[model samples]
Target: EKLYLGMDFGTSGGRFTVIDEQGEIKAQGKREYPPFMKEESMGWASSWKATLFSLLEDIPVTVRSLVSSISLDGTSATTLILNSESGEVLCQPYLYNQSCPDALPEVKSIAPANHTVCSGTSTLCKLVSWWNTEVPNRESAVLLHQADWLLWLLHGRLGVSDYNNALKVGYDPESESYPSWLLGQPYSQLLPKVQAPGTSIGNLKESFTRQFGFPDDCIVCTGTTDSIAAFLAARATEPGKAVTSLGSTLAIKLLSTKRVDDARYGVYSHRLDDKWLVGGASNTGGAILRQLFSDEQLERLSQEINPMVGSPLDYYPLQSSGERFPIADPNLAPRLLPRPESDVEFLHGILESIARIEGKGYKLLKELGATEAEEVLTAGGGAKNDKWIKIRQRVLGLPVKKAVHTEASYGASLLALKGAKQNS
Candidate 1:
């Protein structure tokens, strides 16, 4: 029985999932970074490495021994630089959410307008941030995405990356190469050689295999961004099927036969074999609910709201002005005015509005040439609300169901299996 492993390094922590060929999870583990990661440059890298090892150590030894291949996923745009030969961390990693406003001007000068790299939070901007502010030593180093660096640590590779994680850094998925504009830049050499997600890179290092009891022949394959991995975990492969993540923010991904890229609405697509994962995100989501009520209150009040009865109050609940998808208005104002005295009614109004926005998101996606959503799989915190699900179903006019599993690590394990088989 061949077993595969998937690992996810996320914003909060790391998770490991082991699965068989049939996709039954055999084992799993998790580890979190220290809270004070921002205190020092070196500390961040060291802590991540520590968490990686800790997750591996927690895996069941019996199950670990049978692992055939391993793949990883990490937060998109998280980046680092390291010494090429010695594999030492050159500086602090840029967390995915961190922005380099000062670097955007440089990016804009070379990149096409409204290109993904033009944004302050992009990996390209982060790269520009390091190049301008820090002076590198005479020793040559390589820039890597978070997953790439971690995979390198496991497989003893110096510079390698996947197209998905490399997207925000200006790697062109359409051409499967770094664009000329990016390569024309002064620091192009620092970028990793991009491969498709799940491409077999190499075998695991003897050090890890020997220490962890993994098979000596176990391959370490290329990885993807965490969101893609999670989509893989959801198992929504067919076109017209979609996943809506209702976490702190609302994100929707629909598998499409045609690729779409609309920077005006912050829309883009990630290549998935011949198909594309086209989607966009909105700032409004569970965060608004968090503001109005605690988890306990939310659960209690949600039960009181009748899904059968539509609330007359129409609201666009946002943390502040500005929404990205369906309605891409930066100055868009929150519409929670004329609040009903009943807390349950207020909650109903907010939930209904969010559901409506979600429905609009899918409609816009189809308008942009994506396949019409046939089935919707819900994930994240908001997915737990039955009332919210009913509300969304009524708004979307499509059957909505909860995902079988929502862990990126599990999806990454499937990537490992598929990569290993394809390469064989």
Candidate 2:
């Protein structure tokens, strides 16, 4: 049976997975970033390409020969500028985390209020910063999201990107074209041609096949952002299902047939085919537990708490004064008063409160036209808390479970397989 390969470039490292058409994994590998190659460094593209090649070389040689297609995912909004003719990186990449407030005024000139592109860390802001300093390069350089550049290394194609990666840069997926305002910009020619994620881009360059000893017919497909890729890794494609990431902060995404884009609460829909990933994030999560107790203490105390009985001590559960998602109050105060004698009881209340917030976030999406989540598949550090999961289940009034896989590379493999089927 032929195999498909998927690659992921996240904040900390790079990873890859190869799988059979039946969706079972055959091989996988990862490489954490070396200190010399920082996120904003110009060497990132070459370093990432080397990391990818190293990962592939480690895969069973025969497994590489059987590969049918490849796909990739990168952190959302990580962007790069490159020379159009030579394909050399023109400057340092703008990471998803790097805010370009210097261009916020410029961004506001074109983007409507509350538009995703107006943000300090958005792709548009990143591009606008370059436009001000290096507008002359517009004729000779091209702009690409992080994943698009990686795909280009295999396919030898430029100006091609998936809509999900292009969204923050002001490419309108609904119209399948750049907006009139964006098109009027002098740098408009730098935008990549957008397509759906998992769409077959083209065959890999002959040199890649020759180097890897893979069949020349192996294709490279358009890719997705890391967040969407991780969402797919959970295997939650049903319209009414959702995924929650309980890292240092809490984040939620609801898959729905209808679109939802309310910026008032930092809510927006990410398009993948016809379904929209309507989601939001809240500042309250496991960070509070870190301040209160060690991970070992948190785990031991959670086990002592009876999740089935529920705790009467209600709290908003915040690190400080502010909130997002279900409630968008910046001045919101933490409600940890009336502490219980038992640490177990205090932990129970905090877990339950966050669960309540997650449920409300899902319901808020439904009210805005998304399908209310039928179930939630969770990811991240909080996913390990069995007692917390049980508390969330009761508070959410639905089934809650840890995801089978949360790696973006696994999702890229799934996308590669989907593209192979679509083109066949």
Model 2 per-residue lDDT at 221: 98
Top model number, lDDT: 1
Clash pairs, model 1 backbone: none
lDDT of 2 at 241: 87
TM-score list, all predictions: 0.94, 0.96
How many clashes would you count in candidate 1? 0
TM-score of 1: 0.94
lDDT of each: 0.90, 0.88
- What global local distance difference test value does model 2 have? 0.88
* Per-residue alpha-carbon lDDT of candidate 1 for residues 1-424, written as tens digits (9 for 90 to 100): 8899999999889999999988999998888885545656665777778888888888898888899999999999998987777877777788899999999999999998899889899999998888887575622767999999889989987899998999999988888999899999878878999888998999999999889999889999999999999999998899999999999999999999988999889899998877899989998898988988899998999999888788888899998899778897889999898899999999999999999889999999999999899999999999999999998888789999899989999999989998889878
